[PDB]
Structure formats: structure tokens, C-alpha cells
Amino acid sequence: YDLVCIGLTGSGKTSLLSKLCSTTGFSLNVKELGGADNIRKYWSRYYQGSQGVIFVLDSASSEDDLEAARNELHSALQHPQLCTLPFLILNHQDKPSVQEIKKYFELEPLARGKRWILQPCSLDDMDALKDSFSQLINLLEE
Amino acid sequence: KEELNIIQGALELRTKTVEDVMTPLRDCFMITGEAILDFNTMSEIMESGYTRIPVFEGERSNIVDLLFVKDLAFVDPDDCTPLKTITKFYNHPLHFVFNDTKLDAMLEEFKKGKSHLAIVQRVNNEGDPFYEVLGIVTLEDVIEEIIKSEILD
């Protein structure tokens, strides 16, 4: 199963992925793409042959970085190679607002009627990540 | 007889790849990111007849955006709007497909109607291997190939 992971902090996301296995390019076959500004434009070069996406956003990040994350998720949502696929949206172990993410990301109106799941996840909460991945795999089975 | 033409066309389609029917990069009408959508550029764009134009930055093999001709119906040519405004506003998706991809799979990717133009890239290879841009392919090209096979009717 070929999956793609795109998110802010590309090496940070690849570290979160390495935590599961006990960057800036091609890395359950999860390919983690880099999060640098230049590589975000070239992200779309790798999307082919994917069956699901794992989108990571830094909710604790600054407002502009959150704006970039919202724009990137919106671009991924309407991509023809990714629009028909189910993909899960996941941040840090401990954070100083899923409802805020839904309201500000406008995922209630646009992200409606398709097998998409926005679930909380933390680096110190392994079981929650396992449950989120189990739901994602259950969606992949459809 | 007619079944012979049917089988020949089916064989031609099954053997044919996207690399065969694509337009190579040397023939592709493109435009740089630094361009400005002034009166002269719009004439050059509207005369080529292409409805979707790849927009690159730096090199013709570095494609960063797509330009839609329908987006140029409301623009005025005197304001000299830069291309960056339209590209950053619309931000159309970029389709990338490999050269080895077959007619059926690439054709399936268009079925959703969310896109009509893809960029053919090759797995090139010393030095670290990379993606190499070969050309562009459209839904029109595959449909022209299918009708050119005269299978239907």
C-alpha cells in the first residue's frame, strides 16, 4: 500500500514517521516529502501511484505557517490524483483545538461526504496514533 | 475483414504509451514565471490555440504552474498585470505522470474531469538519479489517438 505524507516541518514529520519504525524527497509504503518552501511547489512530482495521504500540520505554529498548511491541504484536496483517495489529517506530543482547525480550515463545508478523517495525535500518545492509522487503513479497505 | 481492423487497432492502442503520443518539451508552448500579462503577451497566448499553457521558472524543465485561457477573458491588457498574480490566485493543480504509464491508466486519471493536461516525466540515470521532464500530454491527444484507430463506428 503506497501512501504519501506531506506536511510542515518535513524533517520533523520524517522524525515522527521514524518514531513509528522504532527527507526532502522520496523516502504500508509511506513516502514522506520535504516541508521546505521550495520543495512544496515540486511536491506534485511524486503523487502518482498513491492510495492515501497523511497530512501533517503544526497547529502550534505561527499564524502564517498555519495559513500555508491550510493552503497546502486545500491544494492536495482538489488534486485529481488525490481527490478520489481517502486521506487522514493529523501534531506534537504536548501542546499549550480540533474545532478551531475545522472552523479555520473550512473542512466542514468543503471536506464533506468523502472518506476523510481529522484526528488528534501526539508523539507521546502512541495508542492514539495507532487508532488513527487503524481508521485510515479501514478507509483504505473501501 | 472488419474484425481485422478492430484487432489491429486494439493492438496499436495496447502497445502505445503516453510517451509515444505526448508532445516533447521542445514543441510545447510554455511561458516563464517572470512574464507580464500585457497586451502583447495576450496576443501571443491567444494565437497559439492551446487552452492550458505550462508556466515554468528558470528552466523549461522546471514547471511550477498552469495557465488557463478562460482565466484571461476578464483581464484588461492595459493594466499590465503580471502573470504571478493570476498564477498565485488560481493555483491550478499540476499533473505529473511517468513516461511508462499506459494509455488506459493515464486515460483513467482524466476520467474525473478535474484535469486535462499532464507532464510526462522519466526516471533518469554516476550522479544521483532524478525526474526528467519529457513533454506534456492532454486528454485531447489520447482521444485523437483512439479515434485515429478508427475502432468505433
Residue numbers in the entry:
A (entry chain B): 33 to 54, 63 to 67, 78 to 140, 142 to 147, 151 to 196
B (entry chain A): 429 to 553, 556 to 583
Question: What does the publication say?
Answer:
They promote efflux of Mg2+ ions on their own and influx of divalent cations when expressed with the transient receptor potential ion channel subfamily M member 7 (TRPM7). Structurally, CNNMs consist of an N-terminal extracellular domain, a transmembrane domain, and two cytosolic domains: a CBS-pair domain (also termed a Bateman domain) and a cyclic nucleotide-binding homology (CNBH) domain.
The large asymmetric unit contains four ARL15 and four CNNM2 CBS-pair domains. This twist generates two contact surfaces between the ARL15 and CNNM2 CBS-pair domains. The larger surface contains numerous polar contacts and involves two ARL15 structural elements: a C-terminal part of helix α2 with following loop and the loop following helix α3. Significantly, all the ARL15-CNNM2 interfaces show hydrophobic stacking between aliphatic part of Arg95 and the side chain of Phe524. Although a GTP analog was present in the solution, the binding site was unoccupied, suggesting that nucleotide binding was incompatible with protein-protein contacts in the crystal.
